[PDB]
Structure 1
Amino acid sequence: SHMATFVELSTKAKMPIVGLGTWKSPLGKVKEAVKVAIDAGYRHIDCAYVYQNEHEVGEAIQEKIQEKAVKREDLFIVSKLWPTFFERPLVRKAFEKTLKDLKLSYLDVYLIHWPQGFKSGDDLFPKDDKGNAIGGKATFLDAWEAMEELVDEGLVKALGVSNFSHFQIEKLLNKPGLKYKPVTNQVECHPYLTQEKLIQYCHSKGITVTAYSPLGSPDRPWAKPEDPSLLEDPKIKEIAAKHKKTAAQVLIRFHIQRNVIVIPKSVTPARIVENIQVFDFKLSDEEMATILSFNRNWRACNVLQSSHLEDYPFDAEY
């Protein structure tokens, strides 16, 4: 029986500092992964419309609620709005699909998944004849307006953003008539991409950070063998040995000690349990400084080529 520390959001809601990632968790494996996580004591599950598995997540959650293994109010369910759905009627239709698949009556956090709006229609990844991403009509500020309505209606408890630079968050925080502030910014982060300035900025604004791909996303389709590999880094494994822990557990604990929420994905029952066993050790200040020194400014998750649309987040220094 495990419990992740709570990080307090600006709304006073309590967000578990470790959650289960579900990107690439296949149909036919994700349902069990979520059951196992809930049995182990995970309460935060990270989800998205684009992962196309929310209905199996919804099945797992419903079954554990019926079983009385957990109550809804102790779960913390996060989903995201995909940028082909920024137009107002579409915000509400995409949201309703996620909430239906997940079989819930409310979400704990709903995120803008990426800051650039894309052409609406059937394709999730609309591209021109040359394969460049096609921009849409509505901006992330337009979508945010429609998302605030969901909070007014009691269907989402808090809103947040993902893949935002500080410039894009400034634009949001400065929007005229802003009703709700983002409670987290979910971005890639790990010892090869330490995000020092973006974390400093977010915290200074009362915005949490959620670290995605904290293990280096080894299962990402575009991985190349010469790409840095955190889980095989010998200096990470050495610090791990010193604490009698795995590299993955050190990689998860790194974020916990910076007060950054972290969402490792697994569909392997043993690794699910291993990844939440991270509250029985502490990395020394020396060890934190060493791990922080590994920054390479390297992004594993840098596939959208959309740097020719406005609001490309990764051109900014942070």
Structure 2
Amino acid sequence: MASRILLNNGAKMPILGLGTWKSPPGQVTEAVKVAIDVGYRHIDCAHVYQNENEVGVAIQEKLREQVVKREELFIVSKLWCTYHEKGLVKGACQKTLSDLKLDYLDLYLIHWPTGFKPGKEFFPLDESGNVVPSDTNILDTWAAMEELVDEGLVKAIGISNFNHLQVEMILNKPGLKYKPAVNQIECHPYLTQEKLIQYCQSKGIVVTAYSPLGSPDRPWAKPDPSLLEDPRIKAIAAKHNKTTAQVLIRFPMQRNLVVIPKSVTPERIAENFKVFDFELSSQDMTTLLSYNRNWRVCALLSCTSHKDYPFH
């Protein structure tokens, strides 16, 4: 299969990237180095993950080694919720740029639609545990994102964890200058996202699937359904002489999605890339879709009263 998808900014995005949430800072530099050595050309990052400096060390070393050229990499990061303010967006982007050792990002996303009170804490709470909102809306945040394109800091802008109506808000914005290129959302066989994917794809927005393996290392995991251990998915994998993870990665690829599995295990980083030499049948695809149960890795009770919390 073709390795890149065309975005509505005219640039091409690798359909397979390396996730970095939870990648320990003492492991992620090697993980990214290995990933680039074995063919990855897309890294998914975020300031809130607290490891962009270490990701950046890897990127810079591989550029300095001339393993890759900068134009061949597709580096994605995300604006955290406490920086939804006109006067904070540029500096947030620039901190990410400085940490990643870059002069531009290929794609910069609004990480979640909700703005929170600015400050040192990533999740400012009231004394009863509710997140403290910002009054700044997704449209004003979007205008700030558009400025980053116009200043050369980012080549593309997009959104993440935006629901149907929030995507529509963005598309209907008065004076919209740049459409979102991407909506990055959770997507896997237990949360197949057909409705949101069809909406987004119908509008030309590319969808990136996060937590494609069901985020087994998520910190709130309970001893919960498990994609990697689902014998029905294992059976499809066995039939194709592939791993369950490889099936779980190939699945979104054949839906015209980008997918960003995370690993810090070198052998798995390599395994996860070996997904361009086999095809799931239409019956396999429909069978995997049939496993939907509307199960989310990423949700957060403290944020559920925010006006713009995306999920119900």
Counterpart of 2:60 (choices 47, 59, 62) is 62
Q: Distance in 2 between matches of 1:163 and 1:63?
A: 32
| CA shift for structure 1 position 306 | 1.8
Deviation digits for residues 151-200 of structure 1 (CA, Å, limit 9, x no counterpart): 01111001000000010011111111111110110000000000001010
| CA shift for structure 1 position 308 | 1.0
Counterpart of 2:221 (choices 215, 220, 223) is 223
Q: Which runs of 5+ in 1 are unaligned?
A: none
Q: Distance in 1 between matches of 2:310 and 2:9?
A: 26
Q: Which runs of 5+ in 2 are unaligned?
A: none
CA contact 1:22–1:46 (8 Å) conserved in 2: yes
| CA shift for structure 1 position 303 | 2.1
SS at match of 1:232: coil
Deviation digits for residues 255-276 of structure 1 (CA, Å, limit 9, x no counterpart): 0110110000000000000001
Q: Does 1:250 align with 2:236?
A: no
Q: Does 1:312 align with 2:309?
A: yes
| CA shift for structure 1 position 304 | 4.5
Bigger shift: residues 280-289 or 3-12: 3-12
- Indicate the percent of aligned positions where both proteins have the same amino acid: 71
Q: Could you tell me which amino acid in structure 1 is paired with residue 153 of structure 2?
A: L
Q: Could you tell me which amino acid in structure 1 is paired with residue 51 of structure 2?
A: N
Q: Distance in 2 between matches of 1:12 and 1:191?
A: 30
Give me the TM-score of the superposition, normalised by structure 1. Answer: 0.96
Instruction: Tell me the equivalent position of 1:190.
Output: 188
Instruction: Tell me the equivalent position of 2:280.
Output: 283
Instruction: Tell me the equivalent position of 1:263.
Output: 260
Question: RMSD of the alignment, in Å?
Answer: 1.0
Q: Could you tell me which amino acid in structure 1 is paired with residue 231 of structure 2?
A: P
Deviation digits for residues 106-136 of structure 1 (CA, Å, limit 9, x no counterpart): 0000000000111111111000111111111
Aligned residues: 312
Q: Does 1:177 align with 2:185?
A: no
Q: Distance in 1 between matches of 2:281 and 2:140?
A: 45
Bigger shift: residues 103-112 or 144-153: 144-153
Give me the TM-score of the superposition, normalised by structure 2. Answer: 0.98
Gap change, CA 1:289 and 1:125, over 3 Å in 2: same
CA contact 1:81–1:110 (8 Å) conserved in 2: yes
SS at match of 1:194: coil
Q: Distance in 2 between matches of 1:304 and 1:116?
A: 13
Q: Does 1:237 align with 2:222?
A: no
Counterpart of 1:47 (choices 45, 64, 69) is 45
